Amino acid sequence: WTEDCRKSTYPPSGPTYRGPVPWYTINLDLPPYKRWHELMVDKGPMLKIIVNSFKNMVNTFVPSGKVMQMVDQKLPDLLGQFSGPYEEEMKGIADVTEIPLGEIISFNIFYELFTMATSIITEDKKGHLLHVRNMDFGIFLGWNINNNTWVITEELKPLTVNLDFQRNSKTVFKATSFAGYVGMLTGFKPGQFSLTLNERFSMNGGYLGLLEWILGKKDASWIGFITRSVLENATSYEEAKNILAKTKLLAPAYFILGGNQSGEGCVITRERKDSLDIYELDPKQGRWYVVQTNYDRWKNPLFLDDRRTPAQTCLKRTTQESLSFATLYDILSTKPVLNKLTVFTALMDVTKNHYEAYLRDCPDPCVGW
Ligand SMILES: *[C@@H]1O[C@H](CO[C@@H]2O[C@@H](C)[C@@H](O)[C@@H](O)[C@@H]2O)[C@@H](O[C@@H]2O[C@H](CO)[C@@H](O[C@@H]3O[C@H](CO[C@H]4O[C@H](CO)[C@@H](O)[C@H](O)[C@@H]4O)[C@@H](O)[C@H](O[C@H]4O[C@H](CO)[C@@H](O)[C@H](O)[C@@H]4O)[C@@H]3O)[C@H](O)[C@H]2NC(C)=O)[C@H](O)[C@H]1NC(C)=O
Ligand SMILES: *[C@@H]1O[C@H](CO)[C@@H](O[C@@H]2O[C@H](CO)[C@@H](O[C@@H]3O[C@H](CO[C@H]4O[C@H](CO)[C@@H](O)[C@H](O[C@H]5O[C@H](CO)[C@@H](O)[C@H](O)[C@@H]5O)[C@@H]4O)[C@@H](O)[C@H](O)[C@@H]3O)[C@H](O)[C@H]2NC(C)=O)[C@H](O)[C@H]1NC(C)=O
Ligand SMILES: *[C@@H]1O[C@H](CO)[C@@H](O[C@@H]2O[C@H](CO)[C@@H](O)[C@H](O)[C@H]2NC(C)=O)[C@H](O)[C@H]1NC(C)=O
Ligand SMILES: [Cl-]
Ligand SMILES: [Cl-]
């Protein structure tokens, strides 16, 4: 079920609003191992539940139990040590929650593969940029007939957190993530740039990237880890763009990157080895937005999953003269851009240092895809 462009959905309320996203300060001055301990006090019980769901469903489809045995006993050794800070951060999470490290690593692997998204950057007539996104998730292990949801997708909602990463008590970047995950998929560096990651599918894909890694070719970056390293350590739109366009990746991806002034917005369509396309704002020629879902801009959607066309229609209807968090939230609340897989909606304003995220629901009748 789809619908006409929504209006009057902001500030959030009603049946598509699950609730607010809590803020946590992550202190980069702490040793990596300790950075997540305070968050785990609050969200550790929920992380234990989501890994329980994954384990139990895998052990249902593979009743020998041998896959989860490999996850728990061998997966860390197959991949080898991660570069810092990620190894120690994940070990800290595993140790405080008493979850096997291989399951934390597996959780961190989920985000290289099973997300869907709608990401939008807009530029108004004053040159002001907004960057918004829906974060969708579907691993499709468990269906709950009693409320028409996917088990793991729903369990991500209480794991969702807004994070203020600080060094010397000063914000470096802000992000929305899931407790237990140490990469980043959504965030901004105030006054500098904003970044969202959308999954991309291809036959030279993440499954092959993992195989190459296991077989000893480790020159590549994990997509959630390069995103985190850019947010944490890059200092400008152009620097971020260069890193994201050129770094070798474990999996294909779309990077949606906004800056801090007119014209600074692009979609970088990535193969593992390089950029297939960089599509940038061109306000002088009437190109005042970019919209990216999970298919290549020059190709047709997957017939049964076209969120790009409705997002673009609602944007064109809104026009460049009525761009704000409120009107962009309206778009991200319109089915199928909002769908049963939508975990959260995030809204970013780099130059005004405004960052919001909201947990979502999509009441029946709603598309599951
Ligand atoms: C659709 O159903 C999902 C599954 O729920 C089951 O099926 C439905 C149909 C009912 O029969 C229900 O009774 C079944 O259990 C449902 O998923 C549930 O979502 C909630 C809300 O996110 C989760 O709540 C979190 O619970 C953990 C503790 O969970 C344990 O204890 C509770 C209380 O006894 C049990 O109900 C659980 O089964 C577990 O045994 C908390 O740690 C966690 O707290 C943290 O997050 C909240 C924010 O939500 C903060 O306020 C806190 O401070 C903490 O930071 C949550 O309270 C629940 O775990 C989850 N269940 C499962 C099994 O995944 C889903 O939301 C439904 N979706 C829709 C659209 O209706
Ligand atoms: C962004 O860039 C920075 C700068 O390159 C990256 O920071 C480095 O990260 C690696 C991996 O985690 C660290 O390497 C470890 O260092 C351990 C020793 O750490 C102590 O001694 C260091 C001197 O050798 C010292 O620099 C370090 O202080 C740093 O960390 C403290 C704890 O967080 C913090 O309070 C300090 O202010 C300072 O930031 C420690 O006191 C060693 O045991 C390990 O084997 C490993 O080698 C580096 O220490 C980090 N360097 C700095 C200057 O922070 C960072 O990871 C990048 N971020 C991303 C996401 O990619
Ligand atoms: C947008 O970002 C750019 C790039 O970081 C900013 O320009 C830099 O500003 C710093 C000061 O923090 C200077 O040290 C650099 O020399 C500047 N670089 C360039 C290429 O000019 C710019 O100030 C930001 N603009 C806004 C409006 O925030
Ligand atoms: Cl699921
Ligand atoms: Cl919730």
Numbering used by the authors: 27 to 395
From the paper:
Acid ceramidase (aCDase; ASAH1) is the best studied member of the family and is prominent for its involvement in Farber disease (FD), a genetic disorder in humans. aCDase is ubiquitously expressed and found in the lysosome where it normally regulates sphingolipid metabolism through intralysosomal membrane turnover. Similar to other Ntn-hydrolases, aCDase is synthesized as an inactive proenzyme that requires proteolysis for activation. The α-subunit consists of a globular helical domain formed by five α-helices preceded by a 36-residue linker region, whereas the β-subunit contains two central anti-parallel β-sheets flanked on either side by a total of six α-helices.
Two structures are of the full-length proenzyme before autocleavage, from naked mole rat (nmr, 83% identity to human) and common minke whale (cmw, 85% identity). The autocleavage reaction was prevented in these structures by mutating the catalytic cysteine residue to alanine (C143A). In the proenzyme structure, the peptide bond between Cys 143 (Ala 143 in the inactivated structures) and residue 142 (methionine in nmr-aCDase and isoleucine in cmw-aCDase) is intact as shown by continuous electron density. Residues 141 and 142 complete the β-strand, which leads into a tight turn preceded by the C-terminal helix-α5 of the putative α-subunit. The presence of an intact junction combined with the orientation of Cys 143 completely sequester it and the scissile peptide bond from the outside environment, confirming that autocleavage must occur intramolecularly. The structure reveals that a possible general base is Arg 159 as it is the only residue close enough to hydrogen bond with the modeled thiol. Thr 141 is conserved across all species of aCDase and W1 is found in both inactive structures determined here, suggesting that it probably plays an important role. Interestingly, the conformation of L4-6 in active human-aCDase is essentially the same as in nmr-aCDase.
